[model samples]
Target chain A: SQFTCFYNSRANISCVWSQDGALQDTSCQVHAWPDRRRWNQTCELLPVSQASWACNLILGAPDSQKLTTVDIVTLRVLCREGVRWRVMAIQDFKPFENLRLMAPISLQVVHVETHRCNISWEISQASHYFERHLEFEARTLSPGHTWEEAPLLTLKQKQEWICLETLTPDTQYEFQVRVKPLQGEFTTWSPWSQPLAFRTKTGH
Target chain B: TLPLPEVQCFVFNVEYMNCTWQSSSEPQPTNLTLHYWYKNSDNDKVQKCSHYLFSEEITSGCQLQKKEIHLYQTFVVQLQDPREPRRQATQMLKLQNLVIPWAPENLTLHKLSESQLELNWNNRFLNHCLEHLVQYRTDWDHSWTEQSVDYRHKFSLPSVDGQKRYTFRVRSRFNPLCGSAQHWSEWSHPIHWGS
Candidate 1:
């Protein structure tokens, strides 16, 4: 069977390999390397379940790790059979630029009143490996005017909303927000969200 | 027939015990009674749960006041439909296993010097011992560096460049007892500073 690889989460990263009837016997040792670097990690093969073909290659630990963000890591797993270690499978996880997260969708304006309204958004459906830390910015524009400076917002929940107050009456204001990672400043922000426009009560 | 009882419970700091449960039926059973008692008490007597934020027949949640709670104890929780005596659900849980330490607060950062940074925090649980995991990173990368510490409640960083900006945060959990696992608190709000 061919080798397959995927990432494991929780403040750390891992590459797991699976096949049919790979580690039935307890004589072979497992090893893997990341990003073409030296094979610096070794671990006892973990069954993790009743299946005979699955094992974990813990590439790094949470606090102590060898793999960094945004790198091409080619992993090769080997098992010792009788006298020598054999290359059981060579799997390359390429173009893996962390597709684990999707962009926030369905931005909507709710609870519109004379003085204020609320901005709501849904979070990106992401895998378990990535933490739910996000930053947001909202920029407002008056009726037929250029965009103003975006106000910085820190989001505490996966899906959250904020209320804007002290707005002008009889004028329409449109706003849109973008997101970036709270952990990595170097990480790029997602594209701007869909613009949401709302008008206050004409008689105030 | 007596309907099944689905329950969730939490015991924190030998102070208060909270147990929330629901009956299988949507509109709660016509009449409901909550039976709660500690399993290992010498008398093995059952005590009625006294605190009800809502009438037992109406609400889905329940609570146990701190005066009636204790540390390192085991309790038996059962919900019964008063109309059907036999229909019920029961659960046995231990206090040590249910301890989820509160989040660390008052997380403050100190710039000791041009190349050194220090972090400090406080835990509200005075009786329970604590250990913490400190996470921080430089503005240069998203990669986080974590450090685990015991008792001190403070962490000093390596000789980071004074000019680089950094973000720091921390979380905590009770010290493990009797080979039991402690639930950790969520990380504190991060503090960012250029040093």
Candidate 2:
């Protein structure tokens, strides 16, 4: 496996590089456009068995570190062996919607009414001045059954609470919410939030 | 017939708890409602609570507000399936250990001068906040500048470098003198500014 680099919603720079080979040292650089700012730091050797090294660096300090949807960044990693530095790998990462996604947190069912269930969750802590919202998917399990997609449903961004309707009564259901920025540079859906659990109203 | 109702609760802030539960039986019954009541060991009268703060017939959980929660004491929370009100899920929960306050919001740069910069933010639990921790770093500096303020929504940085831009963030905690260290809020969103 090879390490990759990119800007994330929480405003951190993370990259995990993997190699079938080892090196005497490793370092990386993050290049941003517009102002063409550059952040250079040494990569750390993560103890994981599969990868050679990794770095989850915090680029924003008390001073000027901000990433706009308009900005482009490239991460290059260099390795040293026998007092010689060589290009280990290079991954060009952009904050495109599809490539950058941080999962939402605290996903759960706040209310369950009729055959309806109301879900709630908080977005990632990343700062965003652009238009953004969430995409949701839900699954249900009837007694003695496997999970199945619930009836078609729709949800919007900044909508902290959503009601899942036309659901079957007396059943267990699970759901997850993901995020997608509505406007700005190209971005993609975040991985779905952890499955939230709830049960439809049983007979009164 | 519904299976025995199972319950779990979480305290996100000192002021409230999100106590939720699930019915374990297969083919859950319709019109199922949870009737619940709670009380502390202290002679505090037993308080009844249900789906009052919820949107619909919430089958899972309800926000148990401060009016019904006691931070330092142990509580006996009971959840019953209305159909079989006879059987209940009774558990004891203490709030002192689980409270994690939500982070402050809108931490904006309030003012800038040749020597100092003022920052301001809002916290829902300002009345209970004993102190606020501010951290900022400038692009030209290698380390962060940290400060602790007492009951002040606005904090001023002294002798700020006017030539450099800085980013600021804030977090808060309840007076530990009142409870435990777990009551601290998460860090606020970062704010960027320059003089």
Candidate 3:
């Protein structure tokens, strides 16, 4: 599967790649279900649709040689099965797998690797439930650079997953990923994953 | 009884937005009267400001305002019992105006890294770009939490805690950087996911 399966909404969401029913991503995006509002006895979040793909960027950042993975992003859909959600009309992203989407994406470096970086474009989420309004993008920065997306599995008592790779050894370089779920096709054609800035590890 | 109201709004076509009453002068009353009107596109200038009582009925009608559809309906309800209050007299719901947004489209959800999520949405209006008001709830409970203010472009939720099950939804608030009225775009379709 092109999707690294970086994240999963519920601890037990029946994760699969396609009709082939293959399990994806053991990276542990979801640690445990939300203690307070767990679904079906477990905290399982929903996707906006099948066409959208959630993604992020993991910088092989080094703070005082500590090698801290400074920048990492995880985007997902929280809308549940049988429920509807809405996205703005002009965004570049689309919806799939009952999940959120990202599309026609591009990234540019302001200074090559140190000073400047910007991403701009139009995108949209899934339009289910006929635009009932229940989707979001949780980004923490100064703002602007404005291409668009949403965040899911935002943990309060505990994060669904943490950058376990953080503080670990770095074999692969800086990492920026692009995940675009195909338009109209539930599981076909994914965005080209951005190559890491610098290679850190070769192992999965 | 609520069939047609649910399936097909009386005045609306097959496609309709969810309807709710902004105000009801009377509730569950035995006797009632209804009046409905729009911003009077026909009337010019000052007259347009004055809503014309175009429709009336023996029964008070409910008013609805939605992200996309709104009915500026007025209900004149009167109560029969003063103390018992089983009913009220001279009661009405006055909805000033209605503006419904076109539904959001082209949503994208991406994994920025293991710890963070990147989310973005498209803008619909020509004059106004959408800044989002994002909200989310845990998978267990139905309630949600609101995040961000006047947000445009890509956003990241980092430093996640515990075993998390998070979902996100967004509403487009229009920020005309230099305009008087900052109208909010209709909410984008929600993008929910878990980690």
Question: For every model shown, what is its TM-score relative to the native structure?
Answer: 0.44, 0.41, 0.27
RMSD of each: 17.4, 24.0, 23.0
Per-residue lDDT of candidate 3, residues A51-148 (tens digit): 33332322122111111112112223232223443211111112223233333233322222122222222222222221222222222222223323
- TM-score per model (chain B): 0.81, 0.59, 0.43
The Cα error of candidate 1 at residue A140, in Å, is 51
How many collisions between residues are there in candidate 1? Answer: 4
The best candidate by lDDT is 1
Please, what are the lDDT tens digits per residue for candidate 3 over residues B59-174?
A: 22343333323334442223233235443333333322212334456767676666665667665552243345666666654686565433244455544322556676666543
- Ranked by lDDT, the better of candidates 1 and 2 is 1
> In order, what lDDT does every prediction score?
0.59, 0.58, 0.32
Worst 10 residues of 1 chain B by lDDT: B173-182
Candidates ranked by lDDT, best first? 1, 2, 3
Cα shift from native, residue A161, model 2 (Å): 2.8
Docking class for model 1 is incorrect
Better of 2 and 3 by lDDT: 2
User: Measured against the native two-chain assembly using Cα atoms, what DockQ does each of the candidate structures obtain, in the order listed?
Assistant: 0.01, 0.01, 0.03
